[PDB]
Amino acid sequence: HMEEMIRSLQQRPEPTPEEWDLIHIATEAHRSTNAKQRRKFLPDDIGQSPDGDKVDLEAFSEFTKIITPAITRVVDFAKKLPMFSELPCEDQIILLKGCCMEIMSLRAAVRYDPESDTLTLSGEMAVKREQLKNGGLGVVSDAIFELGKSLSAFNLDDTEVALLQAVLLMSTDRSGLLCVDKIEKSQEAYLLAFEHYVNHRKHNIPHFWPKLLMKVTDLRMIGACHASRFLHMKVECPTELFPPLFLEVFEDQ
Numbered sequence: 001h002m003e004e005m006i007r008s009l010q011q012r013p014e015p016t017p018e019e020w021d022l023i024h025i026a027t028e029a030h031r032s033t034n035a036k037q038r039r040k041f042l043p044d045d046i047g048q049s050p051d052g053d054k055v056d057l058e059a060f061s062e063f064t065k066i067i068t069p070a071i072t073r074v075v076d077f078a079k080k081l082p083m084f085s086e087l088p089c090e091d092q093i094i095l096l097k098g099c100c101m102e103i104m105s106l107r108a109a110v111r112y113d114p115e116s117d118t119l120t121l122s123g124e125m126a127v128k129r130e131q132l133k134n135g136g137l138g139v140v141s142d143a144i145f146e147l148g149k150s151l152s153a154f155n156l157d158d159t160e161v162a163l164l165q166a167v168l169l170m171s172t173d174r175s176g177l178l179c180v181d182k183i184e185k186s187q188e189a190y191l192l193a194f195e196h197y198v199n200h201r202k203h204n205i206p207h208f209w210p211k212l213l214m215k216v217t218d219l220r221m222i223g224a225c226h227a228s229r230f231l232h233m234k235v236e237c238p239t240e241l242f243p244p245l246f247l248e249v250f251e252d253q
């Protein structure tokens with residue numbers, strides 16, 4: 001026990017004005033690159049749940065038509081982060097390929113609406129778990145909805161979502177990177193700045209930070225699992241339906 005005491009005995013350092021700068025740049029890089037009022041729903045006849053793993057081409061088409069902008073927004077987000085913009089093109093590619101699905105999934109998960117039990121892709125199209133699943137994501141769809149439901153309680157604000165994206169972007173998990181050190185350092189700086197921003201928000205939730213950190217694992221699973229679905233998508237879907245950017249970002253794996 002002694003949880004209440006231990007909790008209160010913990011030091012909650014606020015953000016140092018080095019971290020407040022990061023937290024501001026990042027927060028705006030995020031806000032300016034991610035756009036519920038006039039959100040159009042995706043027709044219930046599209047992707048309505050033989051072949052246990054068949055991909056509904058119609059649904060798939062609807063999602064690939066809006067994926068290029070979604071991917072462009074993540075790239076735009078990265079470009080607005082100093083420590084990223086200064087990296088070699090090759091590095092930016094590897095980083096982007098390594099976190100694009102995660103960030104896109106995070107943005108989808110936070111736009112989750114419990115009322116309608118849907119997600120809003122590109123901040124406009126509202127999709128039901130079934131549709132996104134038949135459209136190609138399969139279980140990954142189940143995973144993003146599961147994450148979206150659980151993130152409602154966290155009340156993440158633009159900054160937490162923003163730093164969470166920076167943390168995902170600045171990873172040295174993939175190979176072929178050049179500036180491993182500089183990225184590593186940006187990672188640690190964002191994590192630290194992120195943690196202090198969470199101390200500042202004072203969430204009425206027990207072990208919030210540790211829990212929010214576990215969401216990163218959820219997103220990386222979604223990311224990794226997405227690479228599989230993508231392969232399955234290339235098998236089951238006409239190549240003409242795959243936009244160029246979509247292919248560059250998820251192929252070669």
Ligand SMILES: CC(C)c1cc(Oc2c(Cl)cc(CC(=O)O)cc2Cl)ccc1O
Nearest residue numbers: 063067070104108121122123135136137
């Ligand atoms: C079906 C297939 C084309 C596919 C859909 C897919 O759906 C999403 C889309 Cl379009 C856009 C976003 C992010 C956003 O809301 O901007 C987030 C998500 Cl999860 C992600 C990866 C994929 O390979």
